[PDB]
């Protein structure tokens, strides 16, 4: 069973930002036409070549070996912003150790005079701010006027980010991760905590209106190209980390045992965990909309702080809220820290496979972990400042889960389906597993996933809406250009590798292409 800060954090706010009900139709369309086949595809590439990352494509069409470098750039940017998520979770954890939680009431220093408590909001009869949103935007974020105003580096959040990078650095190497009975604890503790939030959320007054927001689709919103890419790349986001889950928690361990059915087990458990966490979150948001005087779609942040608003707000409606706040943010830290151990281990493994003996493995290699974590911390300092949410939402929308994931998935499916061969790949699959994949996987890699990714990419490129944080901020064109630069640094790995592999190999164009598309 796989779970991370995908299901728990990302899917609720991407669903809430895109109207709730209208998000689930592209979510399940991508889940059953793209996401499970692409997840099985990358798992078969991982099990096929007995190496890691970039050099997994020397046996699958070495012309397109830039998919490995695209995965390198995607996981690097993902590590930076996913660890600043963990910095926010740590900051909420250290603010959870007093008796009465700081987001429960608004009489503190960071609160505006316009606030009053959410319990006393329907007795006013309306431009009154909730205390959870005020705490989130003014003590955790200390949200500035825009990305043009980064303000000052929050030393609280920067030391929380340094603490969680020291936890990562002291566990990636010079240490060991969870192996034995602690695995059995950390496999069911996030599910138990999510079950506690779900049972709490459904019993809140007004959860039914939130579930009606969550499940009933708004069909006019399906014509928004933001919804389709948000859903499909939430699938590709939650499964690229699930790709690293199998690869980093055991390579070729599932060798004869059904890496088809293993992949559908973890994929369906991951998507079901997303769906359960969405039920919990939107039950809380329906409760908050009934409790306040505002709409369900306006009650909280249409942006990444939804899990830091709805889940702490539900924690404040528990018996002993300090207990549930401490354990919920410990759960967030365990989930994202295990996923960060997974992704940083994958990044180190793939870079020391990029240079097997070239200057990395022959030296100490302890210092390479420190340098990678150091520049990843310094890049994480750009989005943990006072304008840190704007840089963070840029990184989340663009750097590792935007059209870049559609680009990588379409290019993997196109290469394996056409330039490598569905039948050749199926023969390899039968060699490792024992049976060729069915017409679902075959026609998904051939037709369905390239058509879905190309259609969503072209559909947003013809019906473009800019990235907006919390429906009210409009990013400046330099910030949109920076986000597209992160996406293209993930995306332009493939064509630049195509060009340099054409120019390094001597011969005519047909001979170069023929040499580079035949596997080695």
């Amino acid at each position: 069973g796989f779970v991370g800060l995908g299901n728990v954090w990302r899917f609720p706010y991407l669903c809430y930002k895109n109207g709730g009900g209208a998000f689930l139709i592209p979510y399940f369309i991508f889940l059953f036409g793209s996401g499970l086949p692409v997840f099985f595809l990358e798992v078969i590439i991982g099990q096929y070549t007995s190496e890691g990352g970039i050099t997994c494509w020397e046996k699958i069409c070495p012309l397109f070996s830039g998919i490995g470098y695209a995965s390198i750039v995607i996981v690097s940017l993902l590590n930076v912003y996913y660890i600043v998520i963990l910095a926010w979770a740590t900051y909420y954890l250290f603010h959870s150790f007093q008796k009465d939680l700081p987001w429960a009431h608004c009489n503190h220093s960071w609160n505006t005079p316009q606030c009053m408590e959410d319990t006393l909001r329907r007795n006013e009869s309306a431009n009154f701010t909730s205390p959870v949103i005020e705490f989130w935007e003014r003590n955790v974020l200390s949200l500035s006027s825009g990305i043009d105003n980064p303000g000052s580096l929050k030393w609280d959040l920067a030391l929380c980010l340094l603490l969680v990078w020291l936890v990562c650095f002291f566990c990636i190497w010079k240490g060991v991760r969870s192996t034995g009975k602690v695995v059995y604890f950390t496999a069911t503790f996030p599910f138990a905590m999510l079950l506690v939030l779900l049972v709490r959320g459904l019993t809140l007054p007004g959860a039914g209106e939130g579930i009606k927001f969550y499940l009933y689709p708004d069909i006019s919103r399906l014509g928004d190209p933001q919804v389709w890419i948000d859903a499909g790349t939430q699938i590709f986001f939650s499964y690229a980390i699930c790709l690293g889950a199998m690869t980093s928690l055991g390579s070729y361990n599932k060798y004869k045992y059904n890496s088809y059915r293993d992949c559908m087990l973890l994929g369906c458990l991951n998507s079901g965990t997303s769906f359960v966490s969405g039920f919990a979150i939107f039950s809380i948001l329906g409760f908050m909309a009934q409790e306040q005087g505002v709409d369900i779609a306006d009650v909280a942040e249409s942006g990444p702080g939804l899990a830091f608003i709805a889940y702490p707000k539900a924690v404040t409606m528990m018996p002993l809220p300090t207990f549930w706040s401490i354990l919920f943010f410990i759960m967030l830290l365990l989930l994202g820290l295990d996923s960060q151990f997974v992704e940083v281990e994958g990044q180190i493994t793939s870079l020391v496979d990029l240079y097997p003996s070239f200057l990395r493995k022959g030296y100490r290699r302890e210092i390479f972990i420190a340098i990678l974590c150091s520049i990843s911390y310094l890049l994480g300092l750009t989005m943990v400042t006072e304008g840190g949410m704007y840089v963070f939402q840029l990184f989340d929308y663009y750097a590792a889960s935007g059209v870049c994931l559609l680009w990588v998935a379409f290019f993997e499916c196109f290469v394996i389906a056409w330039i490598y061969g569905v039948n050749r790949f199926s023969e390899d699959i039968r060699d490792m597993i024992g049976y060729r994949p069915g017409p679902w996987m075959k026609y998904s890699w051939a037709v369905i996933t390239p058509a879905l990714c190309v259609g969503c990419f072209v559909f947003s490129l013809v019906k473009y809406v800019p990235l907006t944080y919390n429906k009210v901020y409009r990013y400046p064109d330099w910030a949109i250009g920076l986000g597209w630069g992160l996406a293209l640094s993930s995306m332009l790995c493939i064509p630049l590798v195509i060009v340099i592999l054409l120019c390094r190999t001597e011969g005519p164009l047909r001979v170069r292409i023929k040499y580079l598309i035949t596997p080695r």
Partner: antibody, heavy 118, light 108 residues
Framework: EVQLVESGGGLVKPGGSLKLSCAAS????????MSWVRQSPEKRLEWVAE????????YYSDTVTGRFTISRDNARNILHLEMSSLRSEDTAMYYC????????????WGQGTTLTVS | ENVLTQSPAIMSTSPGEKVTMTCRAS???????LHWYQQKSGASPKLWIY???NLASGVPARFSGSGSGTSYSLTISSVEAEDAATYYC?????????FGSGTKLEMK
């Protein structure tokens, strides 16, 4: 109806060679891996050689690893088995078997060709 | 090789009697890869039970299979005159694919 017909079996000298030909029809031959299973006159079954769906993954048993070669012609839907250095403990009744899914076994077999070494 | 020592070949059982036959493997088979074949007198083998429990097409429900790992069993609920044949158990996981020995069911 899936049918597998084997041919090219007969008496050969020891240390010689003979070419079997499993001809199959009624199904697509490029999508199913194929194996050769022999049966001794003492009536024990021994798997000889499996070729994959495209011929890129070829396996042999420990008895005939270095002297038996199995080949497929996808175009003519025929499965072959080139032999070499046929020793005395190789007289058998050679069957062609459609083994593609590893969890469903050899679901369709064929007739036999009596390879006789004397 | 993964030598599958099977039950002794000469078993003689009266019709209508519940019978069983074992298939011990030297290595460990993954229990989705061990199959049973029924070869009649002078005829070709045919797939009879696959993945140690499932029934092949044209096989009556009176046949059943059980076991996992090392010990695998074929069970007939009641024997009729069309059940007089030799049964071979066969792992198909490890790349030197091996069949079992004989288990020839003769009448009385």
């Amino acid at each position: 109806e899936v049918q597998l017909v084997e041919s090219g079996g007969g008496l050969v000298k020891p240390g010689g060679s003979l070419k079997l030909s499993c001809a199959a029809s009624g199904f697509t031959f490029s999508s199913y891996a194929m194996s050769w299973v022999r049966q001794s006159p003492e009536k024990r079954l021994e798997w000889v050689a499996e070729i994959s769906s495209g011929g890129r993954y070829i396996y042999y048993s420990d008895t005939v690893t270095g002297r038996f070669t199995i080949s497929r012609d996808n175009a003519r839907n025929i499965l072959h088995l080139e032999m070499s250095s046929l020793r005395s403990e190789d007289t058998a009744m050679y069957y062609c078997a459609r083994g593609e899914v590893r969890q469903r076994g050899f679901d369709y077999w064929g007739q036999g060709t009596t390879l006789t070494v004397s | 090789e993964n030598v599958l020592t099977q039950s002794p070949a000469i078993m003689s059982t009266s019709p209508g009697e519940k019978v069983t036959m074992t298939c011990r493997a030297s290595s460990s088979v993954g229990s989705s890869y061990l199959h049973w074949y029924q070869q009649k007198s002078g005829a070709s083998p045919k797939l009879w039970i696959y993945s140690t429990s499932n029934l092949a097409s044209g096989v009556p429900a009176r046949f059943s299979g059980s076991g996992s790992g090392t010990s695998y069993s074929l069970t007939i609920s009641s024997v009729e005159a069309e059940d007089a044949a030799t049964y071979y158990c066969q792992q198909f996981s490890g790349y030197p694919l091996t069949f079992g020995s004989g288990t020839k069911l003769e009448m009385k």
